[model samples]
Target: MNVIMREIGKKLDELSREFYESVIPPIDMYEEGGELVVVADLAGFNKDKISVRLSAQNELIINAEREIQYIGTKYATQRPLKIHKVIRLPVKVKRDSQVTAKYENGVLTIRIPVEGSVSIRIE
Candidate 1:
């Protein structure tokens, strides 16, 4: 009886794991004119609440959150939807300067210029 109960518990865990879902927003990245341009799809999000952050580990973090209200329809869903994505970049990004972003039509575009190589003269 103990073994049977363990099997049932395992099955229940598997079922719950299968039903769990993760939201991963689609992304497009490419190099253009010596700049790394990244575009992400963030439908149903507002520009004011969206943010872009770069970490010392060469990671780009995008986070957004807002309440969603649908008109003329009653539907069931998880409330307080949010957007969060961490992107590992091939090259290191400079802090603050030379970075710009814009949001339009539920899409967010971020442009960061690649860090140029620097050389120092030996004394």
Candidate 2:
């Protein structure tokens, strides 16, 4: 495909969730040892425009809003940005596991480490 077409394709993929009315962020998960790492793509978002939340149960939700403005009269005058998404993780994670998140180069990396456990007896 040509450059223009490829760019259009990328934009379409980014907007696909809107068509399906999905309130979820697109992410990739990788499991290594007892740790699960999640990576989410969040380009075009300023640091102040993004929000990340982790429930005590390890359900992570990411929300972001972009302010798009048009400048000068041209072939295209407006920008359409996907406003909201809420992704539900498929795996069950320990509530108190160490969790860390970072956004670098437009990608959000979340590292969640699982801990070993043993059964205990109670009186």
Candidate 3:
């Protein structure tokens, strides 16, 4: 009886995950000029409505929501968009490090200095 209940619970969890769409924005990250660079595509969103935060667990969290602008009744029947993305940095980043972000042509570019990398030497 217990084993059957466990199997049913697992199936429910999987179905719930499939029902919701994961909001992951396309992003590119690479090392450039001794700094870590991250670029994401956030087209159709206002720059002021986006929020970026560095989590203590070494994850960059991005959240944004944009309502479709409707100047007239000309095909203004689309739903608003809300997006959330998390990017895990390859190296440990300093919280107070120099960070800069720029948005242009529906692309967002961010640069942060690499404070250090985390590694464990194998004995």
Candidate 4:
């Protein structure tokens, strides 16, 4: 049974795990009063250690950093030190830097206004 189960799982991959959001955390969102409140589950990250940005593509990019004080540590295949995520926002995001985030207990929460289904005028 163990061999059978192993073979069953083994048949699935050899596929590209590249570009996979392995270390990326999940985000939970809520809509309240014309605003979207998102909670990004980022463990082992500090407030000043994380940075977020929204681009023209409307993708919410989040990156968290932590420096390891080690010199080419042998086989340091440890936990992911790189925590980054590119969240695609369906509804348009509000003005730049207008969004505010709160971090506590490694739970990253963001509150931002959103304009849903609105036609943006071109310059």
Candidate 5:
């Protein structure tokens, strides 16, 4: 994998979202006990119009839609209330482990239980 290229792309995404009102909402992720939790500060956009998808590669993808309002020029660009954000998760998913998501009080939360690799005993 080209790590440098990915960083450049990620940086560009940050720069691009700056022009929009809320194209890419800020997200937080951390490991708690044995679970990985991701939280996003997504206000205004209703949960009914937002979707969370897990790609084949296991990356977290967020797609959201909102009503469009025209204020002016830059506002025109920002008028399109849509979000397409991709988040990478370090932990590989195991089938037995489950994932859950919930949105409340204008916040989106996702939790995933994971564990590091280990070799099984061949007794």
Candidate 6:
């Protein structure tokens, strides 16, 4: 029964599709030794084109040009790749320019040193 086999294949494909959608992006922020390690999922991104900025208000701004793989046709209709997210850090980030961002294996990694501190005085 060719029709029966086709229906079975369709059902299996639907299940796998659902599983893929349920997968959440990874964001691991932890303190390693003396520096704060922040890793984010920036799949389909170019490292040289990516920029990382930390505002004085503790907002982390990540900007990157959308890679070709990120602009897929299938999911393009449902979700357009903005590739921009402002995350709130649990700890205060240095305002120094010593931030480093790298993209590798479809993932973008940002490393910032958490040493030293900045105090805001209210008048």
Per-residue alpha-carbon lDDT of model 2 for 32-104, expressed as tens digits? 7777788887776787878777766557677777776658643332232544555555566666667788888
| TM-score-based ranking | 1, 3, 5, 4, 2, 6
What is the TM-score (0 to 1) of candidate 4?
A: 0.65
Report RMSD (Å) for each prediction in the order shown.
Answer: 7.8, 7.8, 10.7, 8.3, 10.4, 7.9
Model 4 C-alpha lDDT per residue in residues 1-123, reported as the tens digit of each score: 987965654443212122233645788978777688779877777678899877788787888876545575333224346667887876777665378888889888887788766588999
Residue 108 miss distance in model 1 (angstroms)? 0.3
* Residue 50 Cα positional deviation in candidate 1, in Å, after optimal superposition: 0.8
Clash pairs (backbone) in predicted model 2: 23-86, 24-86
| Model 1 spans with C-alpha error above 4 angstroms | 1-21, 69-73, 78-80, 116-123
Candidate that scores best on TM-score: 1
Clashing pairs in 3: none
TM-score, candidate number 3: 0.66
Rank order by lDDT, top first?
Answer: 5, 1, 3, 4, 2, 6
Q: Candidate 2: TM-score?
A: 0.60
lDDT of 3 by residue, 34-120 (tens): 688899887778999988877889888888777654575432233326767888999778667788888889888888777775599
Clash pairs (backbone) in predicted model 1: none
Q: Judged by lDDT against the true structure, how good is candidate 2?
A: 0.67
> Model 6 residue 99 lDDT?
73
Per-residue accuracy of model 6 over 1-123 as CA lDDT, tens digit each: 997976787676656544533442357788765567778776654567677888788877776554234343332222223445676777766656477777788676777766555599999
Q: What lDDT score is found at residue 67 in candidate 3? A: 68
Q: Considering summed lDDT, which 10 consecutive residues are worst modelled in model 6? A: 72-81
Per-candidate TM-score against the hidden true structure? 0.67, 0.60, 0.66, 0.65, 0.66, 0.57
TM-score, structure 5 vs. true: 0.66
